[PDB]
Amino acid sequence: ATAAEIAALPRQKVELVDPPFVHAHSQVAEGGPKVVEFTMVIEEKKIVIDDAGTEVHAMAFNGTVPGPLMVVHQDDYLELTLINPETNTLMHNIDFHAATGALGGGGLTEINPGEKTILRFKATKPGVFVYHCAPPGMVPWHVVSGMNGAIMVLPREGLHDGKGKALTYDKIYYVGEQDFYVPRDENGKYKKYEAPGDAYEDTVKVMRTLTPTHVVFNGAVGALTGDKAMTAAVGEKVLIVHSQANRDTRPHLIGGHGDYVWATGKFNTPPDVDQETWFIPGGAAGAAFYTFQQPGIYAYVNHNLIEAFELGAAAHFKVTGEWNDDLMTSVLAPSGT
Amino acid sequence: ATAAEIAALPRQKVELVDPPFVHAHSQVAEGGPKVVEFTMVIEEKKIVIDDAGTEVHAMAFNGTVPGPLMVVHQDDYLELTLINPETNTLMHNIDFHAATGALGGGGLTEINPGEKTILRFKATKPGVFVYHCAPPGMVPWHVVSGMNGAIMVLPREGLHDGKGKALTYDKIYYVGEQDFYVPRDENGKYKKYEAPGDAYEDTVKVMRTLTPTHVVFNGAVGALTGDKAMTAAVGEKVLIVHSQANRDTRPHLIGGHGDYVWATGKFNTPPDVDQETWFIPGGAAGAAFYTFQQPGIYAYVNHNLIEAFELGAAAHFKVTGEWNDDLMTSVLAPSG
Amino acid sequence: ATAAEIAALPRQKVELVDPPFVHAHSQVAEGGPKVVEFTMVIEEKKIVIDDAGTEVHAMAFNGTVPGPLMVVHQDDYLELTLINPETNTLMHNIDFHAATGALGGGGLTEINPGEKTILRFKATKPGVFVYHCAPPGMVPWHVVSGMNGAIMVLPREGLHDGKGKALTYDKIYYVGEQDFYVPRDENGKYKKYEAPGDAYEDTVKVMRTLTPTHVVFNGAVGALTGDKAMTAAVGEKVLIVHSQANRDTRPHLIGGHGDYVWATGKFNTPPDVDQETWFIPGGAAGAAFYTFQQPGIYAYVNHNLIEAFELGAAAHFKVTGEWNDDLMTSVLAPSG
């Protein structure tokens, strides 16, 4: 398309919502290509990542870890206004794995505190894709400080299974998984720091062990539990988008399955089916579609169970509806032999 | 099906066999849906896992690490009687990844020592699937103490390739891979404990390093080597089911291939073909189909070779038959 | 085929080239099956792997880490003359994951210093495959000393997508990724040794932590950058072959994609498409096909960004051509 033709396209401004929720969108594209406009302000902020009060100096797109999910359709243009407020201390940028050129956009979006930039790219390939900050020489430090999220580029005709049958979800959640590397003192207690820069050297030492201290969804241990548990109902079709910008994960819905899983995250690659546990390599997003069949509490985990239950990578679903004894029944409840 | 229809299905009791062997079954389903009944007794016991006398307080379905492979067909029911003898000291349960609801069955099967339970679930999806104990708040500890196994839910018409051609194995083995995290004292010597709970805190410390001290098949270093090597013959078709309930693995048959590999373990997902090394993520089972073409000793490994040859994740196959010089020949033997 | 049939086949001698370049070959097979002849001399040599002067005692096929890429076509025979010069100190061999029998050839190729051997195998399965040394009892040590490479067995009709459309590359590069385990002294300084055997005990200790000190392409931090940046132009189709003989990796072309990725490395397994980041398990090779659409510098990385940018797993592409503002444009350049 020419500059003139792109200029002639409809514009749509989107208001982002905080994960695990996803902004209003249509599964099947409404009309022809558009320039879909997003704005995000980067916040360097102290966050608490567990119930003990362990702090991280997060580097957060839109003030959240993960950054929010942006949704467009194939061959739309995503136009992001990225703002680095003067209250921040570091240069930041953005690399969209969905985009083509200039290191995903990073080469064109290097912004110092007090600066902004506007990047447009054509979303040529359908799928869920990681985005993350990547300042040359400081790349993993920004990413493992939480400066990453994902986008979804839906096919214009919405989702389909591997064999051309339409798949329409009732709801969608975005689970961003974060590996954190928090320095410890000689007693093994987590250290606190005044400014982000003060933590750098100690943090790099931990990073180099390739062993995170915390592995979390939505920025903290237990973030998606209690009144923040995800919800569904028997019969409800749910898409769960999962990303990990730095490190492998292996998602699993305890008590359920991934009926269709685009484990590579790319919609032109046919989904795996009937999955127990799927695999998303570091630097990617994936997506799983499931129709709930049983009510009750589910845990959604990274199925390295140490990572899930010791390090933090467990979320909950609360599911309403009628129990199905055909699918599962307690023939004899726990009772004396 | 209706209530009366479910109640009217035949019930069949099947006797289990210790891994890597698999109980007798038919690849193509015999008759209509059945309620297939299994019983397992949980054993808490000390096992030695290496050549240095290193002990683990194993928590073992049916007395083995891994627990045995249960085989049913799609749309059968699996009905397990799980027994926790009063001589045990921990509560246990079971989560079948093959099952739908109540955390895979874990929510319905929490049995204290001296208790038993019977769980039935419909095996709605074909594939190999992990099962494991998962007492809330102590999940990974039970799993990495060896309390895990797998099941196979065969398609009612048996296995097929990506094009619909039948794939019929002559034999099947179940390799359960176990990551262990054994505490050491400050001199590097592995510690021993009187009771399982005594090891809890020290073990969780090792677990949190995400670095197993041992990675083993069938519960110990060298368990599937030497006189306990698996066997085959040239021309024989072998299915190798492999599980890892907690941690990634990358199986490889040294000297062979995975001709067809359901790497995700699910039979409705078409198998990869001609595989050198396949990948099974922690929390899953996979299955590889191979026709042996050469005789001799094979090694079957997790192809992180440090895990295989330093930490214990190596098995052998002993294969009989005639050497095929077309496939491979020594044109010049090692010579000065 | 019979011995007589094989003896009648055309022979072709190949001259290997150092990675990431690949020796001259045809994508579509030229004529019927051939016996394709290769020779490699093993060099035990010191390599410097980072800008701190850190040394590894490399065990290098053809003097490089990784060893060179050998290219044949399906149902060709690969005939390798492998030489262990008297200047070396250890026994070596070679295991081809592409091969069938005798542990991939390792059982037939054990050569002491001063010995040579000739192995012929039939390349029956199309794909990219790891090869590596594997001396019994010292396997991971040789592999993590850099004694590994890969081969490509092309389909006789060259590459195709999942739907039979031809895929023809203009350029091919071979990236061998290496995990190294370098001992450190009490001050955290990397240790140096004056013979490979001297380093064994200390190196095994590091290996057992499963935590590499370095993860590198082509034997060193920054190897495939600057003078060794890989090159292309807008419109050019490039195949990137990537191997890792011991440890998982997750390749990613920063600024680009894998348009078609044989993530398992096997050409009869249909390629994934539009990949951001693909996954290659330890013990395997994979291949990605991409058509460049934008000029400029790309980084090609293992997308565990700590592994890429702290441990060394980062390469560059330098791509010439015209910028495409339709695909990407700076609407507002960084400004107050």
Ligand SMILES: O=N[O-]
């Ligand atoms: O599927 N329970 O980890």
Ligand SMILES: [Cu+2]
């Ligand atoms: Cu990236």
Ligand SMILES: [Cu+2]
């Ligand atoms: Cu589980």
Ligand SMILES: [Cu+2]
């Ligand atoms: Cu190998």
Ligand SMILES: [Cu+]
């Ligand atoms: Cu940043």
Ligand SMILES: [Cu+]
């Ligand atoms: Cu248990």
Ligand SMILES: [Cu+]
């Ligand atoms: Cu060697």
